[PDB]
Design a protein around this ligand. Structure first.
Ligand SMILES: O=c1[nH]cnc2c1ncn2[C@@H]1O[C@H](CO)[C@@H](O)[C@H]1O
Ligand SMILES: [Zn+2]
Ligand SMILES: [Zn+2]
Length: 271
């Protein structure tokens, strides 16, 4: 059964055992207020949707999770590989106004409870991190550019060097994202990814016609995490494809570039 399991409303809970101490999941497209190409639980404030609808969609998730919107932290998501540590002093950044999101980064982490990391997705890989013993959670957004930039291994490096967490204490869930079934790229993309994998490494793409590659970004990120020291048995990978599962997900590719965003989220409750 998939590690992301449908809840009673428009979200999937991350059911990997190491995440049992966290509020962790990914929304589906249903149960919201948005219309047209954004129908209906569009969580993205920077896709041209009605802001009132989007904020109400976020308030709806906050109700489902019992995790108030005032406690979320969002980031700009510039398709780079930069990551920011956040704390309760960052709560609300980007939660209702995109202009206040943490700028210039594509991943966040925190070692505090009461802080919901919240990133938007519609094909790119959501990478959830937890070190349960140490109370760390993290979340990163990895499309091809962020993967080429090594964002997944950068999170691990920051936890090791700044938070003094061995990679062996880290657990990862790679969430729903576009699969190689639906994601075809060119030599430019694969060439940018080759340097990030070990020399002996199996390549997470297949050339389906000359110069065209079916690319598995989930596996690319898994291979990077393994190389950074995260144990194989600590890495859980969803098989769900955002493009394929049209009844659950917005997809930038399938929806031809005008669509909503799901929210990936992780945080720990404050008692
Ligand atoms: O509210 C938002 N927060 C973060 N990114 C957003 C938002 N709305 C639209 N995008 C866009 O969605 C992609 C992430 O997969 C990024 O390209 C970002 O610019
Ligand atoms: Zn993206
Ligand atoms: Zn697919």
């Amino acid at each position: 059964p998939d590690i992301f399991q449908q809840e009673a409303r428009g979200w999937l809970r991350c059911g990997a055992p190491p995440f049992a101490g966290a509020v962790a999941g990914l929304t589906t497209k249903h149960g919201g207020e948005s219309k047209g190409p954004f129908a209906s639980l569009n969580m993205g404030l920077h896709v041209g949707d009605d802001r009132t609808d989007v904020v109400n969609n976020r308030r709806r998730l906050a109700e489902w999770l019992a995790f108030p919107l005032e406690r979320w932290v969002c980031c700009e998501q510039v398709h780079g590989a930069d990551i920011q540590k956040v704390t309760k002093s960052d709560r609300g950044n980007g939660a209702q106004d995109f202009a206040t999101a943490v700028p210039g980064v594509d991943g966040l982490y925190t070692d505090e409870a009461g802080v919901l990391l919240a990133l938007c997705f519609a094909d790119c890989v959501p990478i959830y991190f937890v070190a349960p013993s140490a109370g760390l959670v993290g979340l990163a957004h990895a499309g091809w550019r962020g993967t080429a930039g090594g964002i997944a291994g950068h999170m691990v490096w920051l936890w090791q060097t700044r938070e003094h967490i061995a990679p062996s204490d880290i657990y990862v869930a790679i969430g729903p994202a576009i699969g190689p079934c639906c994601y075809t790229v060119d030599d430019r993309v694969v060439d940018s990814l080759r340097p990030t994998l070990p020399p002996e490494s199996p390549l997470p793409w297949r050339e389906t016609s000359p110069g065209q590659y079916a690319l598995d970004l989930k596996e690319a990120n898994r291979l990077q995490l393994l190389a950074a020291g995260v144990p194989n048995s600590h890495i859980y990978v969803s098989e769900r494809c955002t493009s394929c599962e049209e009844a659950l997900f917005f997809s930038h590719r399938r929806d031809r570039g005008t669509t909503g965003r799901m929210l990936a989220f992780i945080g720990r409750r404050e008692e």
